[PDB]
């Protein structure tokens, strides 16, 4: 399973081959790489966790006085942080690492640390990537290209073309892409 | 002796610990009204501190004072009672919602949550080991069939369906008053019924509590089919509704 | 009258007499001021009942503790219950950074402590906690926030709160002027004036021995730090000179 | 945690008396009788607003979870029978308590947790599907506990021919009669190709289902 | 602490207080009779008139069957009797499961006495307010009958009674009773003592119920009397 | 816990007159892939304490979290500046944790080095510790400290300690060229020597070097630099 | 009157009773006095003697190097607390190979005081202890029956504690920055004032701790010399 | 550490039972995994609750579960434990430990009361 | 600290449970007739506020395919007893693969109620359940009291004025009666002791037929039977 992720300006994009993408949260997304049942179980547990912190994160009083999927929570009022979700995923994977083994890639936007793309390999192997994140089979065949065209703040259309080329090269050796921004998320499928 | 202390049946029935808990809920005199429309469910309460030993002060962010809370995302609630007990019951309802979402794989229903909380309060009442929670909730929610649902329970644990109700002091005569407002509703787009139910709830609170209810002393929230997410309506919109009613 | 002998039992007219016994006990215990300022916050603890005890080491008995070097916590009730609640706050922050890696937000901590204190006020055999705890923090973007859980388990957001003996007089004194604009460096003189005036036990000599402080403002990079005595002493001299006239 | 010890002592469960005797017997080197492997061709497909499962026998593979949920098993007969009875009665108890229509997602989650708790020991493959408030949904549970909402599924020993026929001749918005014809084109062909009995067809409608055990 | 009942506590002089009050409940229940005969063990009972609409057919609330060769009857609270009879059934069937033989009645009454003594001594829960009349047949000592109580004591009885007016029933059994008594004579004696305890001359058929355990052909067989045979027995009793 | 997957290469730590200098290479090899080249190897528990590792990233990160919470507990109950634990305490804690995991048969795949200063007579920055954001002072070797914790919990103290592939051949160069109380330039030259032979004579090594100093000023993170 | 039946019930004024009775039990104990200086903390005290045949009951217990304490209440509570701090000090020196912070030990024992006075079916300790040490500075601590720990320059427990408190308060300024012999003389004079009954070798419990001198009870000859010095 | 603790009890061979081959090492086989089948699940549940909500929730849950479980019959007759089922929220669920059965032999009832609650 | 609050008083009588019976005397009526072609259970549900949803406040509930249940007491104990009775029914179903007989479920619920009466530190229940059902052994109608004693009733009434209601039922009840006549007698008995005007939404009627599943009659059916 070729899971791909690149951080462009004012937003991040992520992709997978072919249901590897799962909506843990409106402003957070994850792609799977490993065993089927284990990866579904951990994603269900983290979905329950992240929904629970979204429910509890609502503050007390009143403040602030292709498919397109505008956030209901404006201004990131009570969206859980992506780092917290990634680190509890690290903890659950590490506590059960003798039997539980998955390679999940995480990505999303947050108000504190802005756009973010995290990576969770086998065991508790968290690492924050500010530029790109790729894992899975056949990654090396595209890996040099991932260190080729990304300049510093390469843009949305360039990112769409580049990730399409990367996923096509990986598959050769149905595409679906989720982009996450400050104001909205869009998931779209390229045949 | 000690019949009225523990949850003991006492002579000629009338479990008195439940009545004392209900009276303790009534002594807080935070009136909170709930009304059910059609594809909408407005819940309205008062942003006032519960009556107790301490008193309100000028150096206090009044926005933080609130009685309306969210269970998970779609089903809201409003406990009126003691300070700690209200938020403890909120967390217990959250725990039941988490149980349902983890086990059954989909969001909890308002009816199932109300029955589960009623069972837990039943365990509290029957066992004299632990004190009874003096906090009567008022739960609203949209079912899977895209219909509103209003619900309420008490320290007795009487979970029952409703269409318009009120919790707090002076809840006896007010049962008539809301019915008269439903008479006004007895005689439309989604936004039309949303606005009608909102102004009806505000008018109900105005008639019951019987004062102007300035914009900094109301918290309004609605769950409808257009949105379905429990969100608190802003102060300016509440002021607009208050001006429109007058 | 029987109903008052247990926290679990309800009174006939819906008021737990044990809880007001906690309130009376804390109100007859050491006072604790705290308020917000433009630069930061300032919390003060005054130990008046120690005036008879002329044995304590110089400024060794501190009632103001901290969590994560970011949050201040203080109290007015009994020492042991407050220390247990403090260690619970430390444990909560511990578990939070263990299992999520992010510093605990303050509303999470005060909510959990509020339900923890309430979690002893619904049983029969455990002694209820006798402590009114004030948590506080300050951020540059978020300005400041001061919470105060009562022993019942009632948490409210306060711009400024005082608990203990003469609490009404201190709260009247603080409300004379808006302290949002007054800086943290200048508010020490006003706090000295209030504790010297409102409290009868505190004479001129006892202001330096039996008083504690800490801020969170921009000077310490928004982190915990006690006031150095070189800062307190000019404020003490100015307050004594003003009150003497 | 002493109360859980009390719950374990009072309540029953899986007794484990004869582990050591069986260890001695298997180490001593004697062949013991085999299990009833009832794994045959089974399939299902998401037709127009109704799931249409398929199986083959005189062991009726089509089992009942709810008035709008049927399923077909492939593996060990006892595991399938007991797990199906447990799922049916769990859903019935939930329906009685909650008073709502049964949902396929709840069945999928319960089966997934139950099969994931036993990693590979329970040979249990189920193709459970049915109609709920979110329309028809068909799933492809495996013995490792990995559900997946597929438009059509085919499991069993002779699953390759059935899956190939379904992939060849599947279309959206299909008629119910065409669904039954495709169901036989999978199952009957898999029976006559793979190394039996009578086919089984049952349309899973939201209400008023029908079972056809003498289908062919 | 202040709300403690203090069940397992001696009196000022020599007795457990609650155990006495439990015995008073045994003195405030419908009378139950027990007999030994040369061809069976008879154990009648008096049905309290709850109402005329009670289903008289197959509602024998006094006498119950613990095992294929053991039965019993109660003279106290029926709710406690149901659970205690269930535990007696469990012990008898577990003995048959382990040892592969029919339970001797002495062991069963010892075990139910151990239940009642555990509630008497251990813990603080209230004792079991019911007294049994376990009787049956075994190859060890033939026909046997026992009398348990909440205090845990027990002893054999050739003929006995418990419940209201137990003194009158014991007095009637003391006079008219013989070792070499046939089953019919024992049944007539049961009718006579039940009528004497109830104070009525003619026993009412609906107000009583009877049972026995015959050991004919080397096989235990319990028979519980229904309305027709009760009426026949009463008719023969009044005619003699 | 099961076995190594994502492993580093080595870390070189030496003492000199103003403090400790320790250098990693910022590499996390995924067996035979070399996915990452910017991993933060050397952590900082608090002032005058640094914990380097060479092994599985997850075990090292778990130990980093444990040591961080020990430091936060320490700061949470701090009155004097002297109340801060020395590096010996943290080293003994890591040794006990490794021994406990060895007893449980759940070994931590790392080779830890704990380095720092076990006194506060020189610096006075720990009275006012700041977690969330002059001239060098000479420090005697007695007041400095560095330690080791093996797979099996084996521990010791020495002047210079190395982990991983550096333990075979770079230790010879360190024993040859180490001198008491070296200057920062000579110390950095010795580090460059050790890491260039590591880069040449190893496959999983790297040349994108990290340097961090532990001196009277505190912990100083020098910028990354490519070897000559 | 009615609220003192259990240790989880407060009076109408908001005050415990069992804890106050434990404090009274501490007040009934024998006298002990300790005085610090710049780098030396003496811990002397009386030793209870029931009868002439009985030798005195030993009071001072050494917990660890530079750590020793004096009991002024119930003996069993003192034994349990001494065992607990002994285990804590030895465990800390075992696992970490360093001396334990005196503040941490004082907070831990006061925490145990809190747990044992919180729950019912439990009683607070009827003993107060001088947790004195030289963890790089002379310190004297005191944990009350209510969960609380305090720190002083000098202290007295029960018996004629008023005389010792008056003398220590009167001569508090000479105690700081004085020689070891002068500190010993002042502490023994305070104990003599507590007697108001005369100091002897058997009943006196002079003990010295500080820089280059771990906890060790002074020998009989030096104790006799000091009691001769205070006498004249 | 493990394997109980020797205390010169002198009663090693009983007339009710014989020692197991593993004593108390509890070697990992299918019966061992099924023994800790419910304790582990509730450990996970308490982990989830006291993590996300706060450890006071776990405290309240454990005290409520112990209190309702403390309300039960003496050892001997099986206890319904309905209140425990309501509190643990397993009344809605039917599971393998509810159905099936174990038949259980040599211990007198008084020895069971001594073993259960240490008298 | 476990002790029994339901303790034998002087002169016996087990006084605590008797207080629960007073609550059963203070509850609304809930009767039921065992007919020759089925079994009927009926109840008087109040209209305390006039804003209640009549559907939501169930009193005549269903446990199994041929087992109903109605009560006269407080609602929470009815809810928990209903949930445990359902769990026991499914437990029997998995154990034996058949619908639970009425006698076994009645015995189990009686044991549970007696358990709670006897268990330390918990009060008895405050309701008198009224089980009904159909099985291979015919029709059944039982009544579990707070004391736990179960009675094989044929036509019974529990609630306020239960004596007069039972007398009225006995005056106009026979062993051989049709389902319609039984329903009419139930309606007449409910209307006899109401203290007001009986009409739609004030009663709920459940019936289990000789072969059909236990069905709760809808409001239109109840109105039709009212006329």
DSSP collapsed to 3 states, chain F: CCCCCEECCCCEEEEECCEEEEEECCCEEECCCCCECCCCCCEEEECCEEEECCCEHHHHHHHHHHHHHHHHHHHHCCCCHHHCCCHHHHHHHHHHHHHHHHHHCCCCCCCEEEEEECCCCCCCCHHHCCCCCCCCCCCCCCCEEEEEECCCCCEEECCCEECCCHHHHHHHHHHHHCCCCCCHHHHHHHHHHHHHHHHHCCCCCCCEEEEEEEECCEEEEEEEEECC
Q: Which long-range contacts (CB under 8 A, 24 or more apart) does A55-61 make?
A: A55/B70, A55/B71, A55/B72, A55/B73, A55/B94, A55/B97, A56/B94, A56/H52, A56/H53, A58/B70, A59/C107, A60/B63, A60/B64, A60/B65, A60/B66, A60/C107, A60/C157, A61/B61, A61/B63, A61/B64, A61/B65, A61/B66
DSSP letter for each residue of I47-84: -SSS-B-TTTS--SEEEETTEEEE--B-HHHHHHHHHH
Write down the CATH number for the domain with range I5-227. 3.60.20.10
**H63 at I interface, C-beta within 8 A:** no
Q: E198: number of CA atoms within 13 Å, CB side?
A: 22
Q: How far is Cα D18 from Cα B217, in angstroms, rounded to an integer?
A: 71
Q: Which of D134, D86, D93, D138 is nearest to D110 (CA)?
A: D86
**CB contact at 8 A, D107 and D67:** no
For the record, the structure tokens of D82 come out as: 């007991």
Residues 6+ apart with CB under 8 A from G192: G198, G199, G230
E39 alpha carbon, distance to own chain's centre = 19
Whether residue D83 lies in the annotated active site: no
Q: Strands G207-210 and G213-217: what pairing?
A: antiparallel
For the record, the structure tokens of G93 come out as: 């020196």
Q: Give me the numbers of helices (H) and strands (E) for chain E, helices first please.
A: 6, 10
For the record, the structure tokens of B149 come out as: 């649902």
Resolution to 1 decimal place, in Å: 3.0
Domain containing G61 equals 1-231
**CB contact at 8 A, E163 and E26:** yes
Q: Which chains border I (3 or more CB–CB pairs < 8 Å)?
A: B, D, E, H
Vertex C238: Cα angle to C235 and C240 (nearest 5): 105
- Dihedral angle sign, alpha carbons of residues D60, D66, D71, D77: negative
**Contact residues of H toward C, CB < 8 A:** 51, 53-57, 59-60, 63
Vertex I97: Cα angle to I94 and I100 (nearest 5): 85
Helix G220-231 × helix G180-195 angle, to 10°: 70
Torsion of CA F214, F219, F224, F225, to 10 degrees: -30
Number of domains, chain G? 1
Q: How far is Cα G37 from Cα E217, in angstroms, rounded to an integer?
A: 105
Is B234 in contact with A65 (Cβ distance < 8 A)? yes
The technique is: cryo-EM
**CB contact at 8 A, G146 and G16:** yes
**Ramachandran angles phi, psi of B8, nearest 5°:** -115, 145
- Name the DSSP class of E42: B
User: Are 3 or more Cβ–Cβ pairs between I and F shorter than 8 Å?
Assistant: no
Residue H48 DSSP SS3: helix
C158 alpha carbon, distance to own chain's centre = 12
Enumerate the H helices of I44-192 as residue ranges.
75-96, 102-118, 162-171, 179-192
Q: Which of F27, F35, F63 to mutate to test the interface with A (most CBs of A within 10 A)?
A: F35
Q: Which of F14, F18, F52 is nearest to F178 (CA)?
A: F14
I173 alpha carbon, distance to own chain's centre = 19
Residues 6+ apart with CB under 8 A from A23: A29
Q: CA gyration radius for chain F?
A: 17
End-to-end CA distance of chain B: 56
Write out the H or E segment, with its range, that includes residue I131. strand I129-135
**CB contact at 8 A, E148 and E197:** no
Cβ of B73: how many Cβ atoms within 10 Å? Answer: 17
Torsion of CA B52, B55, B61, B64, to 10 degrees: 10
Residue F32, classified by CB atoms within 10 Å of its CB into exposed (0-12), middle (13-18) or buried (19+), is exposed
Q: Which of F224, F171, F161, F221 is nearest to F198 (CA)?
A: F171
**I14 at B interface, C-beta within 8 A:** no
Write out the H or E segment, with its range, that includes residue C115. helix C106-118
Q: What is the CATH number of the domain that holds B127?
A: 3.60.20.10
What are the Cα distances from residue I103, in Å, to A109, F187, I111? Answer: 62, 91, 12
**Contact residues of B toward H, CB < 8 A:** 91, 94-96, 98-99, 102-103, 116, 119-120, 122-123, 126-127, 129-130
**Contact residues of C toward G, CB < 8 A:** 4-7, 18, 21-26, 28, 54-57, 60-61, 78-81, 83-84, 87, 125-128, 130
Q: Which of I18, I54, I73, I76 to mutate to test the interface with B (most CBs of B within 10 A)?
A: I76
For the record, the structure tokens of A171 come out as: 């598959």
What are the Cα distances from residue B11, in Å, to B4, C199, I19? Answer: 10, 54, 6
Residue H59 DSSP SS3: helix
**CB contact at 8 A, D202 and D46:** no
Q: CA gyration radius for chain H?
A: 18
**D109 chain-B contacts, CB cut-off 8 A:** 103-105
For the record, the structure tokens of D169 come out as: 């001749």
**Contact residues of E toward B, CB < 8 A:** 2-3
Residues 6+ apart with CB under 8 A from E88: E66, E70, E72, E108, E111, E112, E134
Q: How far is Cα E185 from Cα E37, in angstroms, rounded to an integer?
A: 9
Sheet strands side by side (includes D199-204): D152-155, D42-47, D50-56, D199-204, D210-212
Q: C80: number of CA atoms within 13 Å, CB side?
A: 24
Write out the H or E segment, with its range, that includes residue C137. strand C133-139
**CB contact at 8 A, I150 and I102:** no
What are the Cα distances from residue B223, in Å, to B74, B140, B226, G37? Answer: 7, 8, 8, 72
Residues 6+ apart with CB under 8 A from H61: H46, H49, H87
Q: How far is Cα B36 from Cα B223, in angstroms, rounded to an integer?
A: 10
Residues 6+ apart with CB under 8 A from G32: G43, G44, G45, G46, G59, G70, G72, G130, G156, G157, G205
Q: What is the CATH number of the domain that holds G110?
A: 3.60.20.10
Q: Which of C173, C81, C86 is nearest to C120 (CA)?
A: C81
- Dihedral angle sign, alpha carbons of residues F138, F140, F141, F143: negative
Tell me the β-bridge partners of A54. Answer: none
Q: How far is Cα A60 from Cα B64, in angstroms, rounded to an integer?
A: 5
**G97 at F interface, C-beta within 8 A:** yes
Domain spanning E1-239, CATH architecture:
4-Layer Sandwich (3.60)
Q: Which of I1, I3, I103 to mutate to test the interface with E (most CBs of E within 10 A)?
A: I3
Per-residue exposure over B163-181, b if at least 16 CB sit within 10 Å of its own CB, e if not? bbbbbbbebeebeebbbeb
Q: How far is Cα B241 from Cα B223, in angstroms, rounded to an integer?
A: 17
Q: Which residue of D has its CA nearest to B145?
A: D133
Domain boundaries, chain I: 5-227
For the record, the structure tokens of C190 come out as: 């006003």
**B131 chain-C contacts, CB cut-off 8 A:** 7-10, 121-124
Residue that has been written with the tokens 């659950």 in this structure? A92
**CB contact at 8 A, C26 and C77:** yes
Active site residues of F: 1
**Contact residues of B toward A, CB < 8 A:** 61, 63-66, 70-73, 94, 97-98, 101-102, 219, 229, 232, 234-236
Q: How far is Cα H115 from Cα H105, in angstroms, rounded to an integer?
A: 14
Q: Which of F64, F29, F106 is nearest to A98 (CA)?
A: F106
Residue G31 DSSP SS3: coil
Q: How far is Cα B67 from Cα B99, in angstroms, rounded to an integer?
A: 24
- Dihedral angle sign, alpha carbons of residues C89, C91, C94, C99: negative
Domain boundaries, chain C: 1-239
Number of domains, chain B? 1
Select from 2.30.29.30, 1.10.10.10, 3.60.20.10, 3.90.650.10 the CATH code of C1-239: 3.60.20.10
For the record, the structure tokens of H37 come out as: 């089948």
Q: How far is Cα A8 from Cα C118, in angstroms, rounded to an integer?
A: 48
**CB contact at 8 A, E183 and E208:** no
Residue that has been written with the tokens 């001396």 in this structure? G99
Residues 6+ apart with CB under 8 A from A127: A118, A119, F28, F36, F39, F57
């Amino acid at each position: 399973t070729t899971i791909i992720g690149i951080i462009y300006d004012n937003g991040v994009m992520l992709a997978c081959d072919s249901r590897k993408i799962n909506r843990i949260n409106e402003n957070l997304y994850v792609c799977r790489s490993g065993a089927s049942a284990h990866s579904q179980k951990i994603i269900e547990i983290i979905k329950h966790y992240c929904v629970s912190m979204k429910n509890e994160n609502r503050k007390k009083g009143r403040f602030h006085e292709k498919n397109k999927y505008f956030y209901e929570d404006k201004f990131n009022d009570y969206n859980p942080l992506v780092e917290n979700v990634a680190h509890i995923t690290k903890k659950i994977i590490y506590t059960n690492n003798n039997f539980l083994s998955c390679a999940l890639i995480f990505g999303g936007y947050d108000k504190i640390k802005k756009q973010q793309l995290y990576a969770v390999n086998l065991n508790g192997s968290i690492i924050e990537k500010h530029d790109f994140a790729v894992s899975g089979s056949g990654s090396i065949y595209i890996q040099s290209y991932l260190q080729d065209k990304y300049k510093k703040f390469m843009t949305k259309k360039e990112c769409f073309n580049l990730i399409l080329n990367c996923v096509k090269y990986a598959m050769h050796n149905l595409i679906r892409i989720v982009n996450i921004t400050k104001s909205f998320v869009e998931e779209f499928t390229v045949v | 002796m000690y019949d009225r202390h523990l949850t003991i049946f006492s002579p000629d029935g009338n479990l008195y610990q439940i009545e004392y808990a209900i009276k303790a809920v009534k002594n807080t005199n935070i009136t909170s009204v709930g009304v059910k429309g059609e594809n909408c469910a407005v819940i309205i309460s008062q942003k006032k501190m519960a009556t107790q030993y301490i008193s309100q002060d000028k150096l206090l962010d009044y926005n933080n004072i609130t009685n309306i809370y969210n269970i998970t995302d779609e089903i809201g609630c409003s406990m009126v009672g003691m300070p700690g007990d209200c938020l403890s019951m909120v967390y217990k309802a959250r725990s039941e919602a988490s149980e349902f979402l983890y086990s059954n794989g989909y969001n909890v229903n308002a009816e199932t949550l109300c029955r589960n909380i009623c069972d837990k309060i039943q365990v509290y009442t029957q066992h004299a080991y632990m004190r009874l929670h003096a906090c009567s909730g008022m739960i609203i929610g949209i079912d899977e069939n895209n219909k509103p649902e209003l619900f309420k329970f008490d320290p007795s644990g009487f979970c029952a369906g409703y269409r318009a109700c009120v919790i707090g002091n002076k809840e006896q005569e007010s049962i008539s008053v809301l019915e008269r407002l439903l008479e006004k509703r007895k005689k439309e787009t989604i936004d039309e019924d949303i606005r009608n139910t909102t102004i009806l709830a505000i008018e109900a609170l105005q008639t019951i509590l019987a004062f102007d209810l300035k914009a900094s002393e109301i918290e309004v929230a609605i769950v409808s089919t257009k949105n379905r997410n429990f969100t608190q309506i802003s102060e300016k919109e509440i002021d607009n509704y208050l001006t429109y009613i007058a | 009258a029987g109903y008052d002998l247990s926290v679990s039992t309800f009174s006939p007219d819906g008021r737990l007499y044990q809880v007001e016994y906690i309130y009376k006990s804390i109100n007859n215990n050491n006072t604790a001021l705290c308020l917000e300022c433009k630069d930061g916050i300032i919390c003060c603890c005054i130990n008046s009942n120690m005036d008879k005890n002329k044995m304590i080491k110089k400024n060794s008995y501190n009632r103001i503790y901290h969590v994560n070097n970011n949050i201040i916590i203080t109290y007015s009730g009994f020492d042991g219950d407050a220390r247990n609640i403090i260690d619970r706050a430390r444990s909560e922050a511990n578990t939070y950074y263990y299992n999520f890696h992010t510093n605990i937000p303050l509303h999470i901590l005060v909510n959990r402590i509020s339900l923890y204190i309430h979690a002893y006020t619904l049983y029969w055999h455990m002694r209820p906690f006798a402590a009114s705890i004030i948590i506080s923090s300050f951020n540059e973007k978020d300005k400041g926030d001061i919470y105060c859980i009562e022993p019942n388990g009632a948490c409210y957001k306060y711009s400024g709160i005082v608990i203990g003996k003469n609490k009404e007089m201190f709260k009247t004194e603080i409300e004379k002027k808006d302290y949002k604009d007054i800086n943290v460096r200048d508010a020490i003189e006003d706090i000295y004036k209030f504790i010297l005036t409102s409290d009868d036990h505190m004479n001129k000599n006892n202001l330096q021995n039996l008083v504690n402080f800490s801020w969170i403002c921009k000077e310490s990079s928004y982190e915990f730090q006690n006031i150095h005595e070189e800062i307190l002493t000019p404020a003490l001299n100015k307050a004594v000179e003003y009150i003497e006239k | 945690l002493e109360y859980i010890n009390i719950l374990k002592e009072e309540n029953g469960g899986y007794n484990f008396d004869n582990l050591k005797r069986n260890e001695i017997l298997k180490e001593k080197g004697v062949k013991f009788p085999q299990f009833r492997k009832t794994g045959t061709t089974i399939c299902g497909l998401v037709c127009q607003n109704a799931v249409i499962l398929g199986a083959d026998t005189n062991c009726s593979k089509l089992h009942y979870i709810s008035k709008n949920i049927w399923c077909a098993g492939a593996g060990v007969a006892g595991d399938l029978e007991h797990t199906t009875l447990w799922l049916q009665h769990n859903v019935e108890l939930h329906r009685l308590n909650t008073n709502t229509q049964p949902r396929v997602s709840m069945c999928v989650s319960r089966l997934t947790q139950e099969l994931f708790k036993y990693q590979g020991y329970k040979v249990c493959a189920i193709v459970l599907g049915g109609v709920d408030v979110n329309g028809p949904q068909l799933y492809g549970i495996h013995p490792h506990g990995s559900s997946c909402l597929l438009p059509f599924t085919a499991l069993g020993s002779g699953s390759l021919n059935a899956m190939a026929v379904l992939e060849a001749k599947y279309r959206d918005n299909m008629t119910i009669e065409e669904g039954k014809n495709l169901v036989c084109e999978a199952i009957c062909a898999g029976i006559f190709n793979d190394l039996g009995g009578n086919v089984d067809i049952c349309v899973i409608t939201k209400d008023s289902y029908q079972h056809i055990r003498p289908y062919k | 602490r202040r709300y403690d009942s203090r069940t397992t506590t001696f009196s000022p002089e020599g007795r457990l207080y609650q155990v006495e009050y439990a015995l008073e409940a045994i003195n405030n229940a419908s009378i139950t009779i027990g007999l030994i005969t040369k061809d069976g063990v008879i154990l009648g009972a008096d049905k309290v008139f709850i109402s005329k609409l009670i289903d008289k057919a197959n509602n024998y609330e006094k006498i119950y069957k613990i095992d294929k060769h053991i039965f019993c009857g109660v003279a106290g609270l029926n709710a406690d009797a149901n659970i205690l009879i269930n535990q007696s059934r469990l012990y008898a069937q577990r003995y048959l499961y382990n040892y592969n033989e029919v339970q001797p009645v002495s062991q069963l009454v010892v075990q139910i006495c151990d239940i009642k003594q555990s509630y008497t001594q251990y813990g603080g829960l209230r004792p079991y307010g019911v007294s049994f009349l376990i009787g049956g047949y075994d190859t060890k000592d033939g026909y046997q009958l026992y009398h348990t109580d909440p205090s845990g004591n027990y002893s054999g009885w050739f003929a006995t009674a418990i419940g209201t007016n137990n003194l009158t029933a014991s007095s009637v059994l003391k006079q008219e009773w013989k070792n070499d008594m046939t089953l019919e004579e024992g049944l007539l004696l049961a009718l006579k003592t039940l009528a004497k305890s109830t104070d009525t001359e003619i026993p009412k058929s609906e107000k009583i119920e009877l049972a026995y355990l015959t050991n004919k052909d080397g096989e235990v067989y319990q028979k519980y009397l229904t309305e027709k045979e009760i009426e026949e027995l009463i008719k023969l009793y009044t005619q003699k | 816990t099961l076995g190594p997957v994502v492993t580093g290469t080595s870390v070189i730590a030496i003492k000199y007159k103003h403090g400790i200098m320790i250098a990693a290479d910022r590499k996390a090899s995924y067996g035979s892939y070399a996915k990452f080249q910017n991993v933060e190897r050397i952590f900082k528990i608090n002032n005058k304490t640094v914990m380097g590792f060479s092994g599985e990233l997850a075990d090292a990160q778990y130990l980093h979290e444990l040591l961080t919470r020990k430091n936060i507990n320490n700061l949470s109950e701090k009155k004097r500046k002297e109340d801060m634990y020395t590096p010996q305490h943290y080293h003994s804690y890591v040794s006990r944790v490794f021994y406990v995991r060895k007893n449980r048969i759940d070994p931590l795949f790392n080779n830890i080095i704990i380095a720092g200063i076990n006194s506060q007579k020189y610096d006075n920055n720990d009275d006012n510790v700041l977690l969330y954001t002059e001239e060098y002072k000479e420090i005697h070797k007695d007041d400095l400290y560095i330690g080791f914790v093996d797979m099996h919990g084996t521990n010791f103290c020495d002047d210079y300690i190395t982990t991983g592939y550096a333990r075979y051949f770079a230790l010879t160069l360190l024993r040859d060229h180490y001198k008491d109380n070296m200057t920062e330039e000579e110390a950095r030259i010795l580090i460059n020597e050790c890491l260039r032979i590591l880069y040449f004579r190893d496959a999983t090594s790297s040349n994108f070097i990290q340097i961090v100093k532990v001196t009277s000023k505190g912990v100083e993170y020098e910028e990354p630099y490519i070897l000559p | 009157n009615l609220y003192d039946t259990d240790n989880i019930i407060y009076s109408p004024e908001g005050r415990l009773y069992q804890v106050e009775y434990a404090s009274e039990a501490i007040k009934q104990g024998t006298c002990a006095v300790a005085i610090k200086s710049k780098d030396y903390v003496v811990v002397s005290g009386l030793k209870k003697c029931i009868s002439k045949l009985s030798f005195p009951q030993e009071k001072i217990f050494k917990i660890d190097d530079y750590i020793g304490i004096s009991m002024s209440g119930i003996t069993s509570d003192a034994k349990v607390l001494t065992k607990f701090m002994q285990n804590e000090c030895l465990s800390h020196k075992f696992l970490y190979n360093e001396n334990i912070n005196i503040e941490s030990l004082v907070r831990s024992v006061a925490d145990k005081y809190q747990k044992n006075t919180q729950k019912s079916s439990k009683r607070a300790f009827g003993v107060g202890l001088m947790i004195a040490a030289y963890h790089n500075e002379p310190c004297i601590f005191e944990t009350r029956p209510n969960g609380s720990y305090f720190e002083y320059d000098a202290l007295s427990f029960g018996a004629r504690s008023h005389a010792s408190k008056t003398y220590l308060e009167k001569n508090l300024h000479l105690f700081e920055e004085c020689s070891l012999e002068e500190l010993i003389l002042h502490c023994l004079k305070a104990l003599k004032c507590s007697l108001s009954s005369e100091l002897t070798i058997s009943n006196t419990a002079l003990a010295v701790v500080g820089k280059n001198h771990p906890w060790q009870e002074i020998s009989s000859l030096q104790l006799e010399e000091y009691l001769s010095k205070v006498k004249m | 550490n493990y394997l109980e603790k020797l205390n010169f009890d002198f009663k090693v061979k009983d007339v009710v039972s014989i020692r197991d081959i593993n004593l108390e090492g509890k070697e990992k086989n299918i019966e061992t995994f099924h023994d800790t089948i419910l304790l582990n699940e509730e450990k996970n549940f308490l982990k989830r609750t006291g993590l996300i909500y706060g450890s006071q929730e776990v405290y309240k849950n454990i005290l409520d579960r112990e209190i309702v479980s403390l309300s039960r019959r003496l050892p001997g007759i099986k206890s319904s434990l309905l209140s425990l089922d309501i509190v643990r929220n397993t009344i809605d669920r039917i599971d393998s430990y509810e159905y099936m059965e174990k038949i259980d032999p040599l211990e007198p009832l008084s020895e069971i009361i001594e073993k259960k609650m240490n008298i | 600290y476990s002790f029994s609050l339901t303790t034998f008083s002087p002169t016996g009588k087990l006084v605590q449970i008797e207080y629960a019976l007073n609550r059963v005397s203070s509850s609304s009526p809930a009767l039921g007739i065992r007919a020759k072609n089925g079994v009927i259970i009926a109840t008087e549900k109040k209209s305390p506020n006039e804003l209640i949803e009549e559907n939501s406040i169930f009193k005549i509930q269903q446990i199994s395919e041929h087992i109903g249940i109605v009560y006269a007491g407080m609602p929470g104990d009815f809810r928990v007893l209903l949930k445990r009775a359902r769990k026991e029914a499914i437990r029997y179903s998995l154990q034996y693969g058949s619908e639970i007989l009425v006698k076994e479920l009645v015995k189990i619920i009686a044991s549970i109620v007696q358990e709670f009466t006897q268990t330390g530190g918990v009060r008895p229940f405050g309701l008198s359940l009224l089980i009904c059902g159909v099985d291979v052994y015919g029709y059944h109608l039982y009544q579990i009291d707070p004391s736990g004693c179960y009675f094989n009733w044929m036509a019974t009434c529990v609630g306020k004025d239960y004596q007069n209601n039972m007398s009225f039922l006995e005056k106009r009840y026979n062993k051989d009666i049709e389902i319609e006549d039984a329903i009419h007698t139930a309606i007449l008995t409910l209307k006899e002791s109401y203290e007001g005007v009986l009409n739609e939404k004030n009663i709920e009627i459940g019936v289990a037929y000789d072969n059909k599943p236990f069905k709760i009659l809808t409001q239109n059916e109840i109105k039709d039977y009212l006329i």
